[PDB]
DNA sequence: TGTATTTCACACCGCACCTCAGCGCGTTTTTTTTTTTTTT
DNA sequence: CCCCCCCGTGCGCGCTGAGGTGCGGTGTGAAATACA
């Protein structure tokens, strides 16, 4: 019985972080119970157009908000989302199982996070079924990164995801992958800016976000990869996780990483400058 | 009043589950006999745009309705959609014909449906003309899952169908297909997220849905596929099958599957949480 | 003075089955002489949009109408549209010249049309210039199907012509085509749904329609196609159907097939006994 | 005197046969000096949309008009748009020079134009540089038919240019071209509808337009082409004409063909009824 | 702040010859200190659509204005826009350097500019760095024709240029470009029309403009281009002008070409009848209202 | 009257140099607190279209402004913009270390800037990791140029950026890149016009912006490229510099270039800028 | 009884409100393109 | 001879013009108050 207001629906959509078309349409039509704006939305002869614009607008808002946040603020906004209970002792026990003292790994992650160039890629190289996939992919899951797949490297759009995410991982790199890295992506693995081709739009020149790679092939030994000995940090995982112990004796969850970052806020050198004293407030495109 | 009202058209099109534009337009022009909104629509000089919006809204509603169901609800809906005359005897008789107990198949099916990692691929290995594809095609028809095709693996978009359906079938996997699974797509058999493209879209990262493959090759006997012995459950098909007057001595219906799942809702351990609304008015708030 | 009304224009377009846009525009601008709505169209300020929308609406109507006709009704609607006068005698005498009893071809059509799996492909085998392509392509043309092309099997885009039509012809299937059928379309000849793929689009999962394949290779004698024995009914076209002395005595115009069907509605196990009121309601789809 | 009337502008545009967008827009802005409607058009704030729609409408009318016309009427049209004055003497002397009585060419064109299967391909077969390509190309241009090319045979996609035009030609058909005609384009010479595989399109089922082949290979003589013995009217070219002599390397201009048709209606058998008797056309 | 008059904006754009969108928009918005129509445009809330339409209209007007000109009058125009004090001795000495006396090139240009078929392409074939691309590009720049490029032969839009320009050119003619000339653009050399596919609205039944090509592949010798043998006039540049050990090499300038045409007007046979009727006494304002 | 004023929004966007849709939309939504016009914007029913048009208009303005500046004026405009503290002494010591007197580099730069034909490509060729990448990347960063990547070369659209900027670089060009330059990019590198294709827009015939390339592969020495000895200039970097880890004398900053150009305004033949007689230029408005 | 001194009373003429719907209204690269690997 | 359920809401941004209705800027007097 009132005039539709697109802004209210954009704000409500952003409240629940609904971005895709079908979800916003379905959830709003189900929410027409106690939302007079929704009941004004249903009887409008341009529902589809409004859904399309609402999704686009929420996408703009979320993309800009994510891009704005600096690394300490981003890891804070992800320690907020890490739900569960569990200490960091799993991390230390796993690394001592792999006979790698923690301090080296901390002294490499410290640099890797800052994107210091020539140190912008970890390598976890070891035999299959050694526990590189679980660790690396969990660390990507807790940093909200995207997995890059080498299957479609013949389509040069496979690097499109590097325009958004903050920790990319390509897993089980073959020899062709290492040669590809040495030959094409010399700049990105260095850390220097590199162009990114995207779909239907314009190429965006961006920094090279931090990476992670797991591969059976060692690179600190193959002398034909002489240009990668100094540009990566290789940690050797040479022991098996899935041993005779019934379950995988070591498994890693968001609680482990969350308490890992809360306890190691200092030794990773993370800090926001001065102002964290207020009551909550956020973008409000509703009026 | 005679003014056309788009919400009514969307409600009607969703009502009978017409998604494609042509069927909506034809059926609605037919229904114009006894629908005031329809006899209004025929005269609205912007018919094509209304039809396109109605089809798009129905597609949005249906797609976001299917993805909002957890697995037991999905199987319940598929059982509700299946009609015919049959029983589970018309299946267990076939299994006893191939000389495999059914209890082992159930102990495997439970895990396979739950998507548990490292146990999320059933391989049916048998010589040609023993009935593999018959059982697999029947089962994947019931689960409403798509079937892949290793023909197009030169063109990396053959995985595009993996983004929607919840039970993928790959029939007649050659040596090349098994090597591809061993090298590239190990993550899916594990159960870790993978990246998949969709023609004119972006690589949507999703968990890999359960699979079902038929191959003459015994992966659990070869030595090149040593790293698949811990990600594949196999069932051997040995006794002969269809060679008799164009009638395979065993054809698996949908009534068979319906009575199978319904009769074994306890052994497969499928259930829902605290329930106080099952057989009620369907939420048709899309009007 | 006379407002435009898109409804009566789409009704007029559907009256004459003017699907394509240019024909709409030209014929309607011509008809403006004695149709007030057409003068309103001519004076209208957005003519091209109306032509485009009319084309789209007519295409929707016609395509949906085709997809909704059950197989006996569609055979009746393809029997109505075939024009010419002839006789089934050409089919009968062609077969009896190939020393093949007609009753064999009937007892194969009875199944091949019903889509029964494992009996849903009719192969015509014989050395070339024996009349295979004559009968096969005449029959596919009657059924309104689409002639496929085994050549482009380097690409997987050559099955795209089966997303719509209800009968396909694969002409001169050599060993490569037979191997391709035995390897990737094992399902199709078994009637169960297949996964076709088109160019610059997504794959669709549809039932495999019936088929007619012409080949020089007796699959039911080969051994590597041991699987193919159970889903292909061979037909031995041996005699020379073409010119015995310079002029091809035998050719199957649409009238021959039409009279064949009309006289053989019973033995094919179909039904066209509607005869409802006079011909049919067929009121309107304005 | 206001409210620019788009119907008038499209009627005028078809009136002057202005089809391309740029011509319509420019000349109309030029005629706006003495045309009130054009002066209204200039002040309109959406001139581009009007120009685009006018081009689309004129193209619709002209394309439908061209497609509608039947073959006797179509030739009666293309026998006027042929410009300039010539003389059939050149074509007669050319054919007499090639030892072919022109009566033979008339009695073969009689079949070839009707599209009658079993007689729907003319092979102008002779040694290189004997005027075969000259004559075939002149005749095919007169009909305004697309000239094909078998040098693109490495793909199937050399047939997509045949979707529209009413006549065809292939240049110096090698054995591969004859093999292609014998194997894959069998229907086109028999009258049945054949599929056409192009790039980023679909198998368009269109009838075969009448064909015309230039080759050095006498298909009527080889024994591995029994299926083309009866669907081809091969013509013999022996004597050379397209040489560098002080005399005429005989030219065959469109006017030559114009006078040829004008004189050869009677023996070429094209009907004249079902006309409109100078009934104009309009779009308003 | 009176109602925006899109006609006035298009008139201003075509007056200043601004065609591309960005230059139109920015230059107009900078002229708001004196044009009431400029503030009128700034006031509206649909600036992008208006600038898009203005660009398209100016494009139409320039396109037709150029294509109206006849090639003799077009050479007159391109001989007015040439300024300097050049001489034709440079081109004569360049040709006599390569041992091809100028009369041959004159007797080829006469036939080429007339666009007669079978003679509608000159290939300047020679080893790298002998003076082929220098002369080719000098003549093309003077004649205002658009220089094509083969690096993008995919997407099939590399041909829209010669839909509206009077002399195209393709340098670095690799084997693939020769193959395209053999199997795609035969109609271009044969005089027959070719359908050039513009990238936004529709193709054109445009006749192929006179061409030019620089290559090292002596197509008059390779038998794989038997069709291309007899439809190009090959001029062979064997003597090189790559003198890196002293005096400066040749360079042909616009004024050199202008003096060449002015001097050899009669021998090049350019004469469109006249222009003296009552249509062109003094009427000049025909631009627009 | 508190209605939206698109002119105000476009002027503001250009005022802050916001270009892309995401930044302008989100940050203006934030500004809607105390910028009455943005508060009106939030209530508009076509927010997305207005955001898109604002992005397009700001692109038009920025592009047509930058393309106007003559090259020495561009260098001056970047010169004032360059902030920080540093001197030209860094560049002098770096080059005099490499056993190249600075006069050689200066007399090559004074030609490279003007795009003089046959000297329009300055390649820094030397043994691996001797300190070339840092210098080329820093100079391109100062001149506001773009750095392409070779990976896109399978798509011809990777040169779309050449129609805008005035200093183009590709770094670590492989051997296929050298063949590409010798075969397709002949005229452009010689000093001629060349066509450029772009996405959704028309192709333009624009001259070739000056270039900088680095590689370990020599082009003046390999007789395969007998065709590039007279059209490029090659500087041989030989000493061990590129560590950035142990001593790092190649630590080039942007203030290095700023004071380089400020101190070399007579021997770079640049004084005759667009500011030959600069007595009144203070003007700026694009309402 | 003659006459200064003033709002109600029917209204010139209206400033300006609200009231409809006939005028404007839209995206298309990327993949596929046959190109030369991709075992042999 | 009187109560055991039908019922899930409102529209192309924006105009804008004839239409007529009213309390007043101004229509401006015979009646009406009080004077002398």
Numbering used by the authors:
A (entry chain D), B (entry chain E), F (entry chain C): 308 to 594
C (entry chain F): 308 to 593
D (entry chain A): 308 to 591
E (entry chain B): 308 to 596
Which statements did the authors publish about this structure?
Here we present a near-atomic resolution (3.9 Å) cryo-EM structure of E1 revealing clearly all arms of the RF and the dsDNA unwinding point for an AAA+ hexameric helicase. The structure demonstrates unambiguously the positions of the dsDNA, the 3′ssDNA active strand within the entire central channel of the E1HD and the 5′ssDNA passive strand, positioned on the top of the collar ring. The dsDNA separation point, the RFJ, is located at the entrance to the collar tunnel. In the E1 helicase, dsDNA is separated at the entrance to the collar domain ring, as the AAA+ motor pulls one ssDNA strand through the complex and the RFJ against the collar ring. The OBD of subunit B interacts with the dsDNA while the OBD from subunit E interacts with the 5′ passive ssDNA strand and is located close to the side of the E1HD collar ring. While the dsDNA sequence of the fork does not contain an E1BS-like sequence, the cryo-EM structure indicates that OBD B interacts with the dsDNA via an interaction between the DBL and the major groove at the sequence TGTGA in the passive DNA strand, 16-20 nucleotides from the RFJ. In the E1RF cryo-EM structure, the 5′ ssDNA is diverted from the separation point at an angle of 95° relative to the dsDNA axis, passing in a groove between E1 subunits D and E. Second, the 5′ ssDNA is trapped in a groove between collar subunits D and E where the TNS loop of subunit D and Lys310 in the inter-domain linker of subunit E escort the unwound 5′ ssDNA from the complex. In the E1RF complex, as in E1HD/ssDNA/ADP, six nucleotides of the 3′ ssDNA strand form a right-hand helix with the β-hairpins of the AAA+ domains, before it exits from the channel. The β-hairpin of subunit B does not contact the 3′ ssDNA either, since its His507 is turned away from ssDNA compared to the crystal structure. Our observations, therefore, appear to be consistent with the coordinated escort mechanism for ssDNA translocation, although a different conformational state appears to be captured in the cryo-EM structure, where the subunit A β-hairpin has disengaged from ssDNA and has not yet migrated back to the top of the complex to re-engage with ssDNA.
Helicases use the energy of nucleoside triphosphate (NTP) hydrolysis to translocate and unwind DNA, providing the single-stranded template (ssDNA) for accurate copying by DNA polymerase. A hexamer of the C-terminal helicase domain (E1HD) can function alone to unwind dsDNA in vitro. The E1HD subunit can be sub-divided into the collar domain and the NTPase motor domain that form rings in the E1HD structure.
